From a paper:
A third vital component of the TFP biogenesis system is the assembly ATPase (PilF in T. thermophilus). The TFP assembly ATPases are part of the extensive AAA+ superfamily which form molecular motors, using the energy from ATP hydrolysis to drive mechanical transformations. The domain structure of T2SS and TFP biogenesis ATPases is similar, in that they comprise one or more N1 or GSPII domains at the N-terminus, followed by a C-terminal (CTD) and N2 domain- which comprise the ATP binding site. Here we present a combination of X-ray crystallographic and cryoelectron microscopy single particle reconstructions of the PilF hexamer in two states which are used to build molecular models for the complete PilF hexamer and chart its structural transition on binding of ATP.
The fit of the docked model was optimized by refinement in ROSETTA27, giving the model TtPilFAMPPNP. The TtPilFAMPPNP structure was then used as a starting point for refinement against the apoprotein map, and the final model was designated TtPilFapo; structures of both forms are shown in Fig. 3. Of particular note is the fact that the part of the structure associated with the ATPase domains is more distorted from C6 symmetry than the N1 domain section. A comparison of the two density maps revealed that they are similar in overall shape and dimensions, but the apoprotein structure is shorter and wider than the AMPPNP structure, indicative of conformational change between the two states (discussed further below). The apoprotein structure showed a consistent contraction towards the center of the complex for all domains- readily apparent from a superposition of both structures and also an analysis of the displacement of the centers of mass. Displacement of the N2 domains appeared to be generally greater than the CTDs: this observation is significant because it is this domain which is linked to the N1 domains in the N-terminal half of TtPilF. It therefore appears that binding of AMPPNP to TtPilFapo triggers an expansion of the hexamer, outwards from the center. We conclude, therefore, that the transition from TtPilFapo to TtPilFAMPPNP is better described by an outward shift in center of mass, particularly of the N2 domains, rather than changes in the relative orientation of adjacent CTD/N2 units. Calculations of centers of mass for each domain showed that the TtPilFAMPPNP N1 domains from both ring 1 and ring 2 are displaced downwards by distances of 4–9 Å. This is accompanied by rotation outwards (mean value 14o for ring 2 domains), which leads to a wider aperture at the base of the structure. Combined, these movements lead to changes in the relative positions of the N1 domains in ring 2 of 10–13 Å which occur on the transition from TtPilFAMPPNP to TtPilFapo and therefore, by implication, after hydrolysis of ATP.
Author numbering:
A (entry chain A), B (entry chain D): 505 to 888
C (entry chain F): 505 to 889
D (entry chain C): 710 to 888
Amino acid sequence: SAAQKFVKQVIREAFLQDASDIHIEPRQNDVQVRLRIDGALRPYSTLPKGALNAVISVVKIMGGLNIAEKRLPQDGRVRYREGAIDVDLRLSTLPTVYGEKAVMRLLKKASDIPEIEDLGFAPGVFERFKEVISKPYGIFLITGPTGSGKSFTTFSILKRIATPDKNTQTIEDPVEYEIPGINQTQVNPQAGLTFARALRAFLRQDPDIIMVGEIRDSETAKIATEAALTGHLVIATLHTNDAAQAITRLDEMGVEPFNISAALIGVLSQRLVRRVCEHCKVEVKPDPETLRRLGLSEAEIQGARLYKGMGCERCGGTGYKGRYAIHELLVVDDEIRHAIVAGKSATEIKEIARRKGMKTLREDGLYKALQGITTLEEVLARTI
Amino acid sequence: SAAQKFVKQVIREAFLQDASDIHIEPRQNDVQVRLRIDGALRPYSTLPKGALNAVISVVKIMGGLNIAEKRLPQDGRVRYREGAIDVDLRLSTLPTVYGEKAVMRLLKKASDIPEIEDLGFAPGVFERFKEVISKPYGIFLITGPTGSGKSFTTFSILKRIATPDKNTQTIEDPVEYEIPGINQTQVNPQAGLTFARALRAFLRQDPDIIMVGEIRDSETAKIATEAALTGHLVIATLHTNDAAQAITRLDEMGVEPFNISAALIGVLSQRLVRRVCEHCKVEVKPDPETLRRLGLSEAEIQGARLYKGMGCERCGGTGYKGRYAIHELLVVDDEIRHAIVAGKSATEIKEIARRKGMKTLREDGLYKALQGITTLEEVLARTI
Amino acid sequence: SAAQKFVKQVIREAFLQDASDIHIEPRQNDVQVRLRIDGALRPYSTLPKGALNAVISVVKIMGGLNIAEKRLPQDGRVRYREGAIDVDLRLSTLPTVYGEKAVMRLLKKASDIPEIEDLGFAPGVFERFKEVISKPYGIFLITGPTGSGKSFTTFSILKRIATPDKNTQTIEDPVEYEIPGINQTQVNPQAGLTFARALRAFLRQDPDIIMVGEIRDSETAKIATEAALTGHLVIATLHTNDAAQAITRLDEMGVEPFNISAALIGVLSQRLVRRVCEHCKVEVKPDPETLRRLGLSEAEIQGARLYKGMGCERCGGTGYKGRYAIHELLVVDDEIRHAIVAGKSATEIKEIARRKGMKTLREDGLYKALQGITTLEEVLARTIE
Amino acid sequence: DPDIIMVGEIRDSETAKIATEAALTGHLVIATLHTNDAAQAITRLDEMGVEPFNISAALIGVLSQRLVRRVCEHCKVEVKPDPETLRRLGLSEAEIQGARLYKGMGCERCGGTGYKGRYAIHELLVVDDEIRHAIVAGKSATEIKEIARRKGMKTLREDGLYKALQGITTLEEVLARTI
């Protein structure tokens, strides 16, 4: 039963190695253990096959799960105590043929969230970001997958808006960060505690500020928007292919455009692209046609270079140390506010914003590759 | 558990400041106790995080909830009418990164009862209000905020029809919205006297007029409606914010649609949207697609301009000049009674009245926005 | 021993003949013994009811089932080895008037899983296929009728990404495709662990890759793809007679159409037609009744050729041997994603998809039959007509 | 691991529910359905309380041969079918209008019944995607049968009535078979 302690080491190290998640998972003889370093699970160690049930006992005990329910999966709130952690970690266990799988999404701290600028918001792009989060109320749409960086933006906004004078309350599946000035709540749509339910719970906590981990049901958008419309500042996320689509998407989702318009101040498209570690960065030259389409033109193409995440100790072995986000910012002026209610397509909205000086995910991903931040490997893999 | 010391310094100040809520915040080392006042927080007292947990149990105690269960969210409400303390507390807890937030929402002092014309309903609504009360039987259902809408306005209906010569009674817990000429009941769910039980007497006593302060039981919803079936004037408060919603909800309560449909004669709503300066107004597009999606009369879809303040020494500071009363009257005819059974949507059931000139919150609101008094955004903020 | 020889040798042959499952099907003297060859049971042997008791008991003894109870249903799991075989088995029984029935499922190991390059794509579409499944997140939807070979395709991609280094996680019933080091969840619906409960846990179990070996539970489809909708890499097994239809099927399974337009990277509708056994692959046909029903291209009619499963023993007496998957690949580009975000039907998606290169399921089969793998007759059976 | 699944008698809700689950994973659930009409057999799972997700994934088609008293062909009495009877039934036009009933008057080939023993009325319902929607929606036996029936497809009602309308059976009997 060695993992009664080993797991705690996994959990501890997941924080120390800058992982977002803790995983202890079995093999035929031993158990594969990984930390989600810079967004990807890495081979931390292994532990004895039988020890996997000890692992389970650790993760179940710390979060109050029925220690005996190794027959079906359960989840909870880990009052986790080891090293750097004094965190309600986001616990789950699941029975597997070689012993039950043990997981804790890390409940990271405010210090683990890159700023609303740091993520890579180009001057004009950032100005628009600020226009939105500086309002006393309204909605900010952010969009992409887990690993889109939307979490970083969303909770970096909290770092920039969740103050002592604002009742910040978040809605997250599960809570990813531990931030001051805020009451950050754990959400589970599979249990019926969807973001729509959590949004009602949120409003009953009488907030000034809201963060929403995912807009999925029409209601998650609509009630996050209601919060804005009850005088709150609302920051919320979707999974679309652009900023423009976040508006189009809320219309596609049946989120009444008049509520989108009532609150919407602006929209951020977002994607993480892995960031090349300076201890492994390798210069390579990109293709002119790809580059034309990505927004370079001839002179930049002649001098264009990409930087590859070749691999080093300082990148967790991923080739990249951390990730940066690709950013596209739309401000809802009246041409756009019209576009919201008119049900305009993502192309229509994006092109208006580009006319106004907005850079797209495609142009930004590229620029970051050219800059020495990433490569048109990761960019392309993680962009539109 | 004191804990309560900090909370109590706050129930003192929060009630004294006419706060919207008392916030026991599950923070990193501590617990903030904050005051949401005039729409936003200011901090007042601080507990240790150990005391957070103590308070989570305290508010669960006040509602008779499972106080031992410090990890899972629960709710209810309590009659906090102890002199200086004269606001009900909405009980809610919600689990975060450091334990549940403990909430004592201030269920704002009744602010008693308006004489319904006082609402400032557009003429096509008010005169029809008068028309609805000219047929004093069945259900006259009203929505809106505690202290500025719920029983505030359903009792306004009573004030206009429930004369001393009518057997009129209400159900409240505690009684706050008071009308001379009328009986007002305190519900004692603790005794087993839930609002359903209170209603069982209202039905059994054969009144001319029945009032439900909060339709808060399957049996409450059912009984109020059963009484209405026979023609009792069952005026009732439905703790939601829109007449259109109120028209179909009792079916969700398990109430037979026979009695619901047979019962209704009209449903009202009211809102506080924020006004603008007018003098220092900012032209904002009354976008017709917004307005069309809303289902507004063309008089408002096309016949319009919105105005926003600049935030603005004549507003403020959100760009709006204080609270603006917006109203609705969904007059119920035979076709509406068919719609109740059908379960027509809030937009549709609302749209029907709007197209008759009966300005709904959505029209009376948006109308007022479209007239340049407020913005469609603030009205949509509330006419969601 | 007589009991060991039947079980060990039928199992050894079950795998050699490409069965998916071994069946001992009770009869009043004699029990039909069949192998689920190419997706359907075939005459391996027969067995006496005396052997139902001895052999069904062996299945039960192996499985961990109750060897006496002719009045209750059963299920379990073992590891099996003899001759050329070292592959796990799923064991189950059900009381029968003839003596209790038994099945031993061939729980193919990871070493039995094909590559992404074995999915039959022509150069253009293959390069795109590769580009699609090589992505770090999103769903690659693998679809088709029961008897489609979906677990190979499903696991060929899992395998691509199934390194113990990464948190690869898949739901099995019971576990078969090991590679240890990747999570191999074993459902237990009696406890509450259905495939949906399992995936519910997969989301809560935050692996890098979410896989469903068999979506028997429609909620499993919802959740597996939900994992993609949320940003995980997803590979999963779902019914479809048209890849465009598969996209619509995701919408029908509760997978949000809106997030699908971002999360779906590719769709593949498959089906098995029986391979003409390589040991008796006689050049015959294409047949005019078959051609008429199918709509075969002249390129395929007058150049490409069919074969007849004349008879080769390891075919179970039919002449057909080996599952032949057909691969209708739909690359999910902007037209498809728009059709998806718009919530479009199989027809609407298919038509834009067709214009964008979606050779259909029926057509891919026609081509492949004539490439000398199967018979168009089999192509008829699994599609039209 | 069925290719083909059978129920000797689907006698209850757990059985209907599970039989339908049994079909869901792609197996041919052939079954004794406690019914007298093929289209009725299709709708029935909803009626049984079968969880509808199983119903949607399960149904492919229905077989009938329900017997009618066979008209005594050799003393068959001309009876006009009512073409409205036939239309209302939903038959394929020719089998409405050119159609003619008979009834036996009693005979050396039927005795005091008017019918020459019995006739098995034919039917094949086929559940395509539109029928799938109809089943889940709770559509009637007449509607499901009427649809499958087109293109001259025989049903307990169309074949039945069709043969009734030749003088093999009486529309009456057929209608009793397909009410």
